[PDB]
Each structure stands twice: as C-alpha cells, then as structure tokens.
Short mmCIF file of C-alpha atoms and ligand atoms in Angstrom, two decimals:
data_model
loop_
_atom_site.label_atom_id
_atom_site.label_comp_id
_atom_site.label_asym_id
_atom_site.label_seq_id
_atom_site.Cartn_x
_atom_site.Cartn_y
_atom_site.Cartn_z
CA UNK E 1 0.21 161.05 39.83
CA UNK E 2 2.86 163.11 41.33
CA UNK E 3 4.58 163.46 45.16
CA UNK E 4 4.32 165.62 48.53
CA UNK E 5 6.46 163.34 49.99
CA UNK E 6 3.97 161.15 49.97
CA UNK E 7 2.78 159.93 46.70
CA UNK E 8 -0.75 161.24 45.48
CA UNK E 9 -3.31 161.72 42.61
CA UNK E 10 -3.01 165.12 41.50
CA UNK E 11 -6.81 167.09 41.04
CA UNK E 12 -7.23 167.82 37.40
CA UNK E 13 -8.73 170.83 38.20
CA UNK E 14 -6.22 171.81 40.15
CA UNK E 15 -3.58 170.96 37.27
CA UNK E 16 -5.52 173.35 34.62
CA UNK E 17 -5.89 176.33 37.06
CA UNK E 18 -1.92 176.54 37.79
CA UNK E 19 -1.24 176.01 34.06
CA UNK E 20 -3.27 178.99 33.26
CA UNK E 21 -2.01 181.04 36.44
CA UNK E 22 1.87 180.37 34.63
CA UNK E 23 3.24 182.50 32.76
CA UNK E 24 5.25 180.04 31.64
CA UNK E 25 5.87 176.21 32.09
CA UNK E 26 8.59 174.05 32.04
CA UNK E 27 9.28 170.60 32.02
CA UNK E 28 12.52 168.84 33.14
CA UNK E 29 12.47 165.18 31.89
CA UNK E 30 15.21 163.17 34.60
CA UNK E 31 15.63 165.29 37.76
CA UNK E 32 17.39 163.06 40.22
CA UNK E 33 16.82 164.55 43.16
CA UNK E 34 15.50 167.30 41.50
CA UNK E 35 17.39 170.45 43.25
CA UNK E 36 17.84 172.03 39.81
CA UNK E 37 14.36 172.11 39.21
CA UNK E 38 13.66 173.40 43.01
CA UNK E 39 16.28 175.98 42.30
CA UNK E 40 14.53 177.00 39.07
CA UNK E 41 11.30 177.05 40.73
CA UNK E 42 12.76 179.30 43.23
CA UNK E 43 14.50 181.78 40.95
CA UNK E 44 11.48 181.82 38.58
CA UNK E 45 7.93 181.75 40.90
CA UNK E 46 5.91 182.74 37.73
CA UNK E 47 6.97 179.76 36.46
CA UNK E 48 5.24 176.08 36.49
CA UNK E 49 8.26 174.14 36.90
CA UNK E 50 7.74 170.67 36.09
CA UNK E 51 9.72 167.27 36.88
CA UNK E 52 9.36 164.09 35.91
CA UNK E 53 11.18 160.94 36.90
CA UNK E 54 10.80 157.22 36.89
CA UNK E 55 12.74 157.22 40.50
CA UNK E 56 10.16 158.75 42.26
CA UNK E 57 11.95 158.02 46.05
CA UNK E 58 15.04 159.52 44.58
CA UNK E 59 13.33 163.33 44.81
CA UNK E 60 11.63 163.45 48.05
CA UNK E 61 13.75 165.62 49.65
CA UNK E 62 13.43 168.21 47.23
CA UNK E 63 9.40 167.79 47.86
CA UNK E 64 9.82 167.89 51.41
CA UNK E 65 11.97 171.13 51.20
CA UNK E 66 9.44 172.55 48.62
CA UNK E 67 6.49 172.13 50.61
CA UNK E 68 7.46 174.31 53.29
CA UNK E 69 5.92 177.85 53.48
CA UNK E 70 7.62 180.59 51.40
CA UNK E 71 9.08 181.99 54.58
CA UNK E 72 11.00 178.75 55.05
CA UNK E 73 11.50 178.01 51.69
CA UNK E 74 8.24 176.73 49.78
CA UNK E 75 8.18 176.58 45.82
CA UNK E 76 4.08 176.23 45.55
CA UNK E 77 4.95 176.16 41.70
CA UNK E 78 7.05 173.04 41.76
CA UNK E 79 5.70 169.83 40.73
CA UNK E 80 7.49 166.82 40.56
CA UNK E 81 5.44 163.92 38.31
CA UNK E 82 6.32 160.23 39.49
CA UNK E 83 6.77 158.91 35.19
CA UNK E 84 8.95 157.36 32.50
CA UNK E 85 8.78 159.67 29.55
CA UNK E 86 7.73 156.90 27.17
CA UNK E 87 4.49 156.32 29.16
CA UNK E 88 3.66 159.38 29.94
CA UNK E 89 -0.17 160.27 30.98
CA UNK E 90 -2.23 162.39 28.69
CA UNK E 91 -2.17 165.04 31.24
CA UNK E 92 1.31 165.86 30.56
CA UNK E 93 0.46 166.37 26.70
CA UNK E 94 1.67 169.57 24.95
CA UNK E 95 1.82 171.46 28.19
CA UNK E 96 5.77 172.76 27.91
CA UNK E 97 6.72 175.95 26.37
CA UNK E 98 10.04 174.12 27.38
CA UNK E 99 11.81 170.81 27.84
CA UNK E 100 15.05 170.19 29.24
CA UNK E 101 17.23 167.43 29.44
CA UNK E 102 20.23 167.85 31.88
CA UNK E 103 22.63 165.16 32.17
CA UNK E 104 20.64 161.82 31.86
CA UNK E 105 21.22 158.34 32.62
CA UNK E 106 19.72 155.42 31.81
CA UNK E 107 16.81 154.65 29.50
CA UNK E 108 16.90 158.69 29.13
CA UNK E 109 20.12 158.80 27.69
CA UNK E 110 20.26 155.85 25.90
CA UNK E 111 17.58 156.75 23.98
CA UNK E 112 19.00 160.32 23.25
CA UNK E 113 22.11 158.97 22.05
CA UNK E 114 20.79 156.28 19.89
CA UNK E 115 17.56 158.30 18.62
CA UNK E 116 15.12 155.50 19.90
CA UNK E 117 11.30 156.79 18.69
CA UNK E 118 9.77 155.86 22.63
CA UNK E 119 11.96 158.05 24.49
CA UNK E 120 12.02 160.76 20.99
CA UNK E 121 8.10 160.70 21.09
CA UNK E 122 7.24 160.78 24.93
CA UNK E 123 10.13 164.22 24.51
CA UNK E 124 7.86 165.44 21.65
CA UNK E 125 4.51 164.26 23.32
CA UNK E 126 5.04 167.16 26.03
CA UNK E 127 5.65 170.32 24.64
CA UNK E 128 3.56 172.67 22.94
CA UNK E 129 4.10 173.68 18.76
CA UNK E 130 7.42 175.92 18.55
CA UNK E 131 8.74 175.08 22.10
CA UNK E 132 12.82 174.54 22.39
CA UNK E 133 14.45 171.23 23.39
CA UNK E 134 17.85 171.64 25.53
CA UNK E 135 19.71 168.75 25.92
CA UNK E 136 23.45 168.54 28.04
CA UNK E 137 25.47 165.71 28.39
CA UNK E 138 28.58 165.58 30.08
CA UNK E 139 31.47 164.28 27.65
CA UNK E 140 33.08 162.18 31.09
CA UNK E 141 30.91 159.81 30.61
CA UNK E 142 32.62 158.51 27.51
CA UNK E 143 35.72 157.92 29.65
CA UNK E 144 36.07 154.69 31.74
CA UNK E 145 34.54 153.32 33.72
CA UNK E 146 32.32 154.39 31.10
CA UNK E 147 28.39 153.59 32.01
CA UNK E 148 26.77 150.19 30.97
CA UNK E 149 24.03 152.19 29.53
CA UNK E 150 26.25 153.75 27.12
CA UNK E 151 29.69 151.28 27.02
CA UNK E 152 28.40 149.65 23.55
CA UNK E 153 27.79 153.27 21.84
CA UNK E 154 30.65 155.20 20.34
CA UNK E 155 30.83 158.78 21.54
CA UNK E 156 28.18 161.66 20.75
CA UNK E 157 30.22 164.21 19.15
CA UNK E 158 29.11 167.15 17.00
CA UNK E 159 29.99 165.35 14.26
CA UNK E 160 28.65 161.90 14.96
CA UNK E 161 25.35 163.19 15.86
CA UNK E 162 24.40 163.59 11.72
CA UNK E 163 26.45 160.77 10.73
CA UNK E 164 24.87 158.86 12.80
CA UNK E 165 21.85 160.51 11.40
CA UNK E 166 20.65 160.99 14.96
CA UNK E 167 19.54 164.81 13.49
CA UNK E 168 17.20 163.16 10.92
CA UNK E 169 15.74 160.50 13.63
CA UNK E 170 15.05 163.95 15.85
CA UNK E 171 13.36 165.92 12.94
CA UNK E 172 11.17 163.12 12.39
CA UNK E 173 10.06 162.09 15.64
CA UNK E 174 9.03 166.52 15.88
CA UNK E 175 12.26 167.82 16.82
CA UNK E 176 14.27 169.91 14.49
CA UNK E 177 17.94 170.42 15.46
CA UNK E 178 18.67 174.08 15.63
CA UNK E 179 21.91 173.67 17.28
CA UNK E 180 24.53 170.98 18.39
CA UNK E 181 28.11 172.14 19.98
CA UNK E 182 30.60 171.57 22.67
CA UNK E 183 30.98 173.66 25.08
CA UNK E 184 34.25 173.29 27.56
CA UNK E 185 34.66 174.03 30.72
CA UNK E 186 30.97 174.32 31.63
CA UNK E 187 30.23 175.09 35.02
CA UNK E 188 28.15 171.90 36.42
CA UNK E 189 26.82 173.98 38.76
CA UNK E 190 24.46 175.37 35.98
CA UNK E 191 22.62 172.31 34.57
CA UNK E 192 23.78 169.85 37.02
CA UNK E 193 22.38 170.31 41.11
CA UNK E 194 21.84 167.67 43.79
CA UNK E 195 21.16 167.84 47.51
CA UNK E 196 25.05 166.43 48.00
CA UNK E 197 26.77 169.03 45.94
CA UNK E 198 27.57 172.50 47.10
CA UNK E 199 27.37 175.19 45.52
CA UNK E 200 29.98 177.73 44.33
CA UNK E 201 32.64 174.53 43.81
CA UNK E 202 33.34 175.57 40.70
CA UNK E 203 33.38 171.98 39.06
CA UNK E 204 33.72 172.06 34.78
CA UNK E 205 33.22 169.36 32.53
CA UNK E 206 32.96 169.29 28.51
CA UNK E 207 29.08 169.50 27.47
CA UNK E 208 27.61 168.32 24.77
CA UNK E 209 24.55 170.77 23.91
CA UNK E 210 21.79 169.54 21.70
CA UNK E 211 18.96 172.30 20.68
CA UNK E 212 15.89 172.00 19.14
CA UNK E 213 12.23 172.87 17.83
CA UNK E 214 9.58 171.00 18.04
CA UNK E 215 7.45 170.77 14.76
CA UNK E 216 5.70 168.26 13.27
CA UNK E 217 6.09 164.24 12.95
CA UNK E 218 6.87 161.73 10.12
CA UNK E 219 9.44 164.04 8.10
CA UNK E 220 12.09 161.58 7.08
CA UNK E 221 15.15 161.57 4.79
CA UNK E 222 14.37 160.23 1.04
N1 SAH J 1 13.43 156.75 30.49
C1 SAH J 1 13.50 157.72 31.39
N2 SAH J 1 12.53 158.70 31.45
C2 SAH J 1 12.61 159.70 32.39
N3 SAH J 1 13.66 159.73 33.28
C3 SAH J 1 14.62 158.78 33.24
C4 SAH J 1 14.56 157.76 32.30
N4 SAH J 1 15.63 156.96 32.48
C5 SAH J 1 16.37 157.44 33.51
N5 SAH J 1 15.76 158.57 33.98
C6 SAH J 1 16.21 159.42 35.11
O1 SAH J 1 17.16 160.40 34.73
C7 SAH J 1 17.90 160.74 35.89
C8 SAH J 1 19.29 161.26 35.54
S1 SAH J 1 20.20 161.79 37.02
C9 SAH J 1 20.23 163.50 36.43
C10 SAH J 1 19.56 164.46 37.40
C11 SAH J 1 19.62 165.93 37.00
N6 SAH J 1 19.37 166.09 35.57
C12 SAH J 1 20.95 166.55 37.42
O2 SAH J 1 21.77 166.92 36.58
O3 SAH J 1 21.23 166.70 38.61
C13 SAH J 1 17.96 159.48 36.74
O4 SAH J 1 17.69 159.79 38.09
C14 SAH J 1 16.88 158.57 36.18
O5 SAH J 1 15.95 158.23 37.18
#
C-alpha cells in the first residue's frame, strides 16, 4: 500500500521488477514530507528510493511533484509506502541495501532513544544481511521546549548510548554499532529537507550520528 497522491495497492509484480531493475535500494524510515527522499531519488535515478511513513497525507506533495514526467521533474524510482515501521508488510522484508533514519519524531525516535525491540525489529526487518543503519538526531531537541516524546528521557550522548546499554539492545535486535559521534555544526540541509525550507540557508545544528550493521538476532550481554 503506498501513494500517487491518491492512495493505492501497489502490483507485486510491479514491486519485484523495479527491485531487480535497481542497482541499489534504499529505504528512509520517517520522511515527513519526504523532499529528502525526492531529492535523493533525483540525484540517484539508479536508485529505488524508498519512504515510509505512518503520516501518509503529510507527503503528498512530494508524490504529486514526483509523478510528473522527467521533463518537469518526475522521480519514476521514488516510492513512498503509507506504514509504521513496527507493522510493516512482508513486502518490505530484507529489501534495503540501506536504511536511514534522519531526524525522527515520535514513536520513531522514542524507540531509537530508548532501544524499544518493535521499532529495533521493524528497522532490522527491512534490510538485507550486511546493509548499514544511519541514524541523525538533532541535539536541539534536548533543549526546551523539549518534545513530549522525549521530555522524560535524559539526553542521547555518545556516552550515554552504552551506558544506557542502548549499543547492546541494537546488537541484539540485528544491529551492530559500528559508529556513534557528534558531529557540530552539521549542515541541516544534508539530512534534513522539507517543502518549507529553502535551500542554500545554511542552517547547523549538533548531530548525533548512530551507525550500524545489520547481522543477526538474539546476541545479548551475559
Ligand atoms: N513509529 C514510526 N514509524 C515510522 N515513522 C514514524 C514513526 N513515528 C513517527 N514517524 C514519522 O517520522 C517523521 C519525522 S519528521 C522527519 C522528516 C525527515 N526525516 C526530515 O528530516 O525532513 C514524522 O513525520 C512521523 O510521521
């Protein structure tokens, strides 16, 4: 089930012959309006950019824009899925040779930050053996008014994240944690897009970057 400004079932056939046409895919998990993915799509056409998104509404201008012809702007190898990642369809299984979460809200981040196993597994559930994880979150967010999803939660640093054994929750759930840093002064303009934002503002924020592999399940500490 995906979008075309309307909302549609998408042919399985369909979704097997432009996986195998790719020579690559990628799946952004929380797009908003999904521009960054469009803009990915754009700069990449060999690519099967994929977005998914609970808030299915919330990208439809991005699908309108992309389903223009290439001479007005088209991006016939975007695809923007209408799902939560904790329920999503079997379709979606082990297709990434990439997952990307940029700046999430909500459930998304929530369950990042706390290491929850349905948010961890439906992350895992998607991407093929060996594929990386990239996951940014802007360090603002830990300043008031700080976000009800995240105001009871002390703040993700480098540090906290194996403290809080957050690194052991990821390489158990498949993910194992190749790198976690802070980078400052991180142009938003390069994980962050939506149809309200220019480009070329030059707007920086501290990012937390979270990278991993995914491997195998059930691999706890002792
Ligand atoms: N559990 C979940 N699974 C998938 N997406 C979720 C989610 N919980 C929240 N989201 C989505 O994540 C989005 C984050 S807004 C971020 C948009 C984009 N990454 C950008 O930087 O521009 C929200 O629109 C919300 O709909």
């Amino acid at each position: 089930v995906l979008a075309g400004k309307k909302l549609t079932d998408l042919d399985p056939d369909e979704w097997a012959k432009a996986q195998a046409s790719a020579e690559r895919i990628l799946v952004d998990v929380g797009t908003g309006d999904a521009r960054t993915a469009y803009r990915q799509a754009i700069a990449h056409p060999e690519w099967l950019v994929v977005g998914v998104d609970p808030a299915w509404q919330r990208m439809t201008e991005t699908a309108v824009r992309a389903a223009r012809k290439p001479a007005k702007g088209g991006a016939p190898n975007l695809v923007l899925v209408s799902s939560a990642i904790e329920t999503v369809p079997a379709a979606l299984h082990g297709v990434a040779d990439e997952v990307m979460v940029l700046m999430p809200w909500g459930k998304l981040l929530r369950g990042v930050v706390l290491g929850e196993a349905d948010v961890l597994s439906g992350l895992r559930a998607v991407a093929k053996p060996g594929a990386p994880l990239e996951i940014s979150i802007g360090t603002s967010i830990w300043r008031e008014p700080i976000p009800l999803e995240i105001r009871d939660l002390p703040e993700l640093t480098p540090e906290t994240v194996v403290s809080t054994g957050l690194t052991d929750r990821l390489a158990a759930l498949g993910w194992q944690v190749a790198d976690v840093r802070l980078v400052p002064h991180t142009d938003l303009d390069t994980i962050s897009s939506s149809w309200a934002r220019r480009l070329g503002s030059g707007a920086t924020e501290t990012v937390l970057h979270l990278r991993a592999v995914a491997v195998d399940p059930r691999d706890p500490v002792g």
